[PDB]
Design a protein around this motif. Structure first.
Motif, PDB file in Angstrom:
ATOM      1  N   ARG A  53      45.115  43.710  43.168  1.00  0.00           N
ATOM      2  CA  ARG A  53      44.054  44.094  44.087  1.00  0.00           C
ATOM      3  C   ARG A  53      44.634  44.114  45.496  1.00  0.00           C
ATOM      4  O   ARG A  53      44.986  43.063  46.048  1.00  0.00           O
ATOM      5  CB  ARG A  53      42.867  43.134  43.988  1.00  0.00           C
ATOM      6  N   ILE A  55      43.636  45.447  49.175  1.00  0.00           N
ATOM      7  CA  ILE A  55      42.626  46.119  49.983  1.00  0.00           C
ATOM      8  C   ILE A  55      43.133  46.176  51.421  1.00  0.00           C
ATOM      9  O   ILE A  55      43.152  45.148  52.111  1.00  0.00           O
ATOM     10  CB  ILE A  55      41.257  45.428  49.899  1.00  0.00           C
ATOM     11  N   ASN A  69      45.606  41.387  33.975  1.00  0.00           N
ATOM     12  CA  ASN A  69      44.553  42.351  34.265  1.00  0.00           C
ATOM     13  C   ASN A  69      43.594  41.831  35.343  1.00  0.00           C
ATOM     14  O   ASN A  69      42.492  42.384  35.490  1.00  0.00           O
ATOM     15  CB  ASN A  69      43.801  42.693  32.971  1.00  0.00           C
ATOM     16  N   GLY A  70      43.993  40.806  36.121  1.00  0.00           N
ATOM     17  CA  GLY A  70      43.180  40.293  37.211  1.00  0.00           C
ATOM     18  C   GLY A  70      42.114  39.314  36.798  1.00  0.00           C
ATOM     19  O   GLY A  70      41.375  38.824  37.669  1.00  0.00           O
ATOM     20  N   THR A  71      42.063  38.941  35.512  1.00  0.00           N
ATOM     21  CA  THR A  71      41.042  38.020  35.051  1.00  0.00           C
ATOM     22  C   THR A  71      41.613  36.652  34.773  1.00  0.00           C
ATOM     23  O   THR A  71      40.845  35.703  34.671  1.00  0.00           O
ATOM     24  CB  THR A  71      40.334  38.500  33.764  1.00  0.00           C
ATOM     25  N   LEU A 120      35.991  33.184  54.352  1.00  0.00           N
ATOM     26  CA  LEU A 120      36.523  32.459  53.205  1.00  0.00           C
ATOM     27  C   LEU A 120      36.806  30.994  53.530  1.00  0.00           C
ATOM     28  O   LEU A 120      37.113  30.219  52.615  1.00  0.00           O
ATOM     29  CB  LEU A 120      37.806  33.153  52.691  1.00  0.00           C
ATOM     30  N   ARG A 146      40.136  50.980  48.928  1.00  0.00           N
ATOM     31  CA  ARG A 146      38.960  50.230  49.358  1.00  0.00           C
ATOM     32  C   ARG A 146      38.494  49.266  48.272  1.00  0.00           C
ATOM     33  O   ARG A 146      38.079  48.136  48.581  1.00  0.00           O
ATOM     34  CB  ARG A 146      37.836  51.191  49.752  1.00  0.00           C
ATOM     35  N   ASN A 147      38.519  49.685  46.999  1.00  0.00           N
ATOM     36  CA  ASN A 147      38.107  48.771  45.928  1.00  0.00           C
ATOM     37  C   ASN A 147      39.281  47.981  45.354  1.00  0.00           C
ATOM     38  O   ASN A 147      39.105  47.234  44.378  1.00  0.00           O
ATOM     39  CB  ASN A 147      37.347  49.523  44.815  1.00  0.00           C
ATOM     40  N   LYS A 149      42.081  48.879  43.818  1.00  0.00           N
ATOM     41  CA  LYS A 149      42.969  49.419  42.804  1.00  0.00           C
ATOM     42  C   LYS A 149      44.222  49.978  43.470  1.00  0.00           C
ATOM     43  O   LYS A 149      44.159  50.593  44.543  1.00  0.00           O
ATOM     44  CB  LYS A 149      42.272  50.497  41.975  1.00  0.00           C
TER      45      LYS A 149
END
Ligand SMILES: CCn1c(-c2cccnc2[C@H](C)OC)c2c3cc(ccc31)-c1csc(n1)C[C@H](NC(=O)[C@H](C(C)C)N(C)C(C)=O)C(=O)N1CCC[C@H](N1)C(=O)OCC(C)(C)C2
Ligand SMILES: Nc1nc2c(ncn2[C@@H]2O[C@H](COP(=O)(O)OP(=O)(O)NP(=O)(O)O)[C@@H](O)[C@H]2O)c(=O)[nH]1
Ligand SMILES: [Mg+2]
Lengths: 163, 169
Positions: A53, A55, A69-71, A120, A146-147, A149
């Motif tokens: 990710r 951004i 997978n980012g999880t 944060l 922006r999201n 990816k």
């Protein structure tokens, strides 16, 4: 305080090295998890994993080496560990902080700020900063959106402890 | 001629907002979880014999970005409020969404559908009757769905279009 490095690759081609100071003096447990995951010394860690990710203008996030997978991700202490303290704040570019899914869910995922992310504070444990290679982190933003990816695979091709 | 509808999909983390949207948009389902930051889609469908362009804003379940989430609600015309039938907390979260939407849009009558997702799973914790009763108290439709089997997916989104259309007239 220990220093660790990441050699960042883009579809396998070297981009450059990012090094980090880890604030063991103020956040020892969280610094030691990231140090050990960077050397691989527990038999698992960041080497090969990706920044999933990115951004631009906010952060670069990575560290999922278990589900890819980012999880996922895990710590040297178990699947999760508690928020150690909130002494340090997200004061600007270069800050290294733990990603999480709510209170006391630290694992291996982390993010590098590319701007101040004060909202944060008190929610994510800050535990290091970029030492050298902020220009490499800036270059990583070409491949985000922006999201978050990424348009190319941004990986930690190699990593370890310095000095 | 066509009509366009601005749909917004909200609900707690992991309830299936994106799986529902991807079944509507792309006609498939995968077990892999791809956590959302924000995604938008467009699809042309026929509802009640009328051609409809659906704009779907798929939001994250993360709730800590009030400035952005308020603008989602100002812009959106109808809201798909999703919970999962095996996640009681996600059902308890629903009234927060309705309260926030009514607040931001300054109205007690906003087009809204309550969606109870993952109805394929054998681990139900939320009775259909409980959700039916809550939707009745709101005066809104309740639809049970499964993004995996596609049960109720078209119905949930198309009912939301019908609620918008009714409100606008
Ligand atoms: C309202 C839109 N929107 C924005 C935002 C706000 C204002 C303006 N514009 C935007 C974007 C550009 O408009 C599309 C944000 C944002 C963040 C989220 C969802 C939507 C967001 C979000 C989803 S999950 C999370 N935040 C925390 C995440 N946790 C996980 O990934 C875990 C992992 C560790 C298991 N996981 C998968 C689950 C489910 O918890 C985590 O620790 N970090 C580490 C810290 C930065 C943070 N991600 C992140 O990405 O911030 C993005 C950022 C900074 C733009 C904020
Ligand atoms: N069995 C089953 N699993 C489902 C269903 N809907 C979603 N899932 C699964 O539940 C997980 C979360 O789904 P997802 O659509 O990503 O939920 P989300 O609400 O969009 N999560 P987020 O808030 O992070 O954006 C995924 O593993 C997905 O396959 C469903 O109807 N049935
Ligand atoms: Mg989603």
């Amino acid at each position: 305080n220990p220093t660790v490095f990441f050699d960042i690759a883009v579809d396998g081609e070297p981009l450059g090295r990012v090094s980090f100071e880890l604030f063991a003096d103020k956040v020892p447990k969280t610094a030691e998890n990231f140090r050990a995951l960077s050397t691989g010394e527990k038999g698992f860690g960041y080497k090969g994993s990706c920044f999933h990710r990115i951004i631009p203008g906010f952060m670069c996030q990575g560290g999922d080496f278990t589900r890819h997978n980012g999880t996922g991700g895990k710590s040297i202490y178990g699947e999760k560990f508690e928020d150690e303290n909130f002494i340090l704040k997200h004061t600007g570019p270069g800050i290294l902080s733990m990603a999480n899914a709510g209170p006391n869910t630290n694992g291996s995922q982390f993010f590098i700020c590319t701007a101040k992310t004060e909202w944060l504070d008190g929610k994510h444990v800050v535990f290091g900063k970029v030492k050298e290679g902020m220009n490499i982190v800036e270059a990583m933003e070409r491949f985000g959106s922006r999201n978050g990816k990424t348009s190319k695979k941004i990986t930690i091709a190699d990593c370890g402890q310095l000095e | 001629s066509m009509t366009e509808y601005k749909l917004v999909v909200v609900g707690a983390v992991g309830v299936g907002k994106s799986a529902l949207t991807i079944q509507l948009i792309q006609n498939h389902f995968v077990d892999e979880y791809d956590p959302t930051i924000e995604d938008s889609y467009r699809k042309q469908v026929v509802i009640d014999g009328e051609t409809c362009l659906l704009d779907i804003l798929d939001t994250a379940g993360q709730e800590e970005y009030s400035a952005m989430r308020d603008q989602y609600m100002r812009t959106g015309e109808g809201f798909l409020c999703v919970f999962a039938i095996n996640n009681t907390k996600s059902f308890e979260d629903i009234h927060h969404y309705r309260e926030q939407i009514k607040r931001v849009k300054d109205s007690e009558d906003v087009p809204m559908v309550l969606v109870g997702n993952k109805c394929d799973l054998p681990s139900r914790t939320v009775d259909t009757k409980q959700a039916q009763d809550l939707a009745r108290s709101y005066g809104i439709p309740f639809i049970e769905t499964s993004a995996k089997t596609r049960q109720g997916v078209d119905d949930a989104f198309y009912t939301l279009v019908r609620e918008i259309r009714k409100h606008k007239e």
